[PDB]
Amino acid sequence: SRRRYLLYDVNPPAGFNLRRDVYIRIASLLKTLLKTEEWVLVLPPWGRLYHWQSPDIHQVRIPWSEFFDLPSLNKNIPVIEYEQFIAESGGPFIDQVYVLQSYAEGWKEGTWEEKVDERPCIDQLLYSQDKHEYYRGWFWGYEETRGLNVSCLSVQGSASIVAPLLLRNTSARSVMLDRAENLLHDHYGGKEYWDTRRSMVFARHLREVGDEFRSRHLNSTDDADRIPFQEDWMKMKVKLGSALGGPYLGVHLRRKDFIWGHRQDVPSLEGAVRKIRSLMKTHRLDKVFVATDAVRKEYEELKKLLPEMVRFEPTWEELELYKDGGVAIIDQWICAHARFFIGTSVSTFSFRIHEEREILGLDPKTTYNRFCGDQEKACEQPTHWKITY
């Protein structure tokens, strides 16, 4: 009716945890759009073109309902699930699809300017026309989706750089931004940002599972970890470093990249196990929870070196249920609540955890921490980004 719809997709290789960063980026834009007209973000169904990236078992068209808490998300910006977008608008039709791309001419130095232009497609377009002239595409796996018009947009700055073009230069009821990761954060550590990031609260069902785990195998519960909780994410502001954590060390070992001949910033199993023990003994920690994507061969090895290790291993049913990002989220949630945490270099999984601990109020010194390559000389820890309420 009175309102315009915003949709987006990201490059196919993008991970679950990155797609989450991009959502914040789009939020940033929408907010800016809402200052002028009536808009609503349409949540892109989870599940991915390269379906062999995820084990799952071929899981697709998953609604955000399964991962986050929608009412929570909505307190930040007006947001709706895709299946409902089809409900509201007549069919699964999109008026305009813009594919985002860099600038053909690239840039010399000095040439940095925020800007966006209609441009010829740098890369071969993936949308094909049907016998009816509609544009068929991947469309988050929704096979019947048809788009009305497709163009490319060269683009440079933050996400909101796009807003005017959408407001003035187009009439479309619904607009989709493909290759959205091309867009940058408006102002990253910003207060606008943190609003969005805090808005994404895990699906209740998921946290309950992690809380189950913490209570059972970790001797950890919210009260004993000195972390008061509040359902309304807005009503929860926390003096920094008040939250204690569970009597356990949280660790996230990101290993499936390693088939790379060499990477300076990831540790050997022995080398990492040494850090673990050093940490356990230092902070007087009893148990250690591990979130890891490791191969069975490597996990068996870890379990040898670290019998005291605890891991969350989902049953088939459990995974078919919570999907990949569901288990992913559980794994994160648990790490977030550990008294002290160490993650893997430049792993956007670990990044999300940093963000969670920073929301719970855990002292930063126990948050931003990373395993070092056995021989890597300059080993720079992750940057502390403080919440702004």
Ligand X SMILES: C[C@@H]1O[C@H](OP(=O)(O)OP(=O)(O)OC[C@H]2O[C@@H](n3cnc4c(=O)[nH]c(N)nc43)[C@H](O)[C@@H]2O)[C@@H](O)[C@H](O)[C@@H]1O
Ligand Y SMILES: *[C@@H]1O[C@H](CO)[C@@H](O)[C@H](O)[C@H]1NC(C)=O
Read off the DSSP letter of residue 172. Answer: -
Residue 62 C-beta: closest distance to Cl ion, Å: 9
State the number of binding residues for ligand X (CB under 6 A). Answer: 20
Per-residue contact flags (x/-) with ligand Y for residues 155 to 184, judged by CB under 6 A: ----------x--xx---------------
Closer residue to ligand X in complex, CB, 90/259? 259
For ligand X, which stretch binds (CB under 6 A), given 15-23, 80-88, 111-119, 230-238? 15-23
Closer residue to ligand Y in complex, CB, 121/269? 121
For Cl ion, which stretch binds (CB under 5 A), given 16-24, 97-105, 267-275, 354-362? 16-24
For Cl ion, which stretch binds (CB under 5 A), given 15-23, 57-65, 179-187, 254-262? 15-23
Closer residue to ligand X in complex, CB, 227/328? 328
Contact pick of 5, 8, 16, 68 for Cl ion (by CB under 5 A): 16
Residue 56 gets the label, from left (phi > 0), alpha (psi -120 to 50) or beta, of: left
Residue 21 C-beta: closest distance to ligand X, Å: 9
Q: Considering only CA atoms, which of 241, 247, 3, 9 is closest in space to residue 126?
A: 9
Closer residue to ligand Y in complex, CB, 128/171? 171
Q: Which does 386 bind (CB under 5 to 8 A by kind): Cl ion, ligand X, ligand Y, none?
A: none
Q: Which residues pair with 175 in a beta bridge?
A: 6, 96
Question: At 303, phi and psi to the nearest 5?
Answer: -55, -30
Interacting positions 336-375 with ligand X (CB under 6 A) = 347-349
State the number of binding residues for Cl ion (CB under 5 A). Answer: 2
Exposure string of 9-36, with b = 16+ CB inside 10 Å and e = fewer, is bbeeebbbbbbbbbbbbbbbbbbbbeee
Residue 98 C-beta: closest distance to ligand Y, Å: 11
Interacting positions 260-299 with ligand X (CB under 6 A) = 291-293
First to last CA, the chain: 34
Are 138 and 49 in contact by the 8 Å Cβ rule? The answer is yes
Residue 249 burial by Cβ neighbours in a 10 Å radius (0-12, 13-18, 19+): buried
14 binds ligand X (CB under 6 A): yes
State the number of binding residues for ligand Y (CB under 6 A). Answer: 4
Read off the DSSP letter of residue 312. Answer: -
One-letter amino acid of 303: K
Residue 93 burial by Cβ neighbours in a 10 Å radius (0-12, 13-18, 19+): middle
Closer residue to ligand Y in complex, CB, 73/176? 176
Interacting positions 30-59 with Cl ion (CB under 5 A) = 48
Q: Which does 358 bind (CB under 5 to 8 A by kind): ligand X, Cl ion, ligand Y, none?
A: none
Integer Cα distance of 72 and 200 in angstroms: 7
For Cl ion, which stretch binds (CB under 5 A), given 8-16, 229-237, 284-292, 361-369? 8-16
Integer Cα distance of 301 and 314 in angstroms: 19
In this structure, the strands spanning 116-119 and 246-253 are unpaired
Residue ranges in contact with Cl ion by CB under 5 A: 16, 48
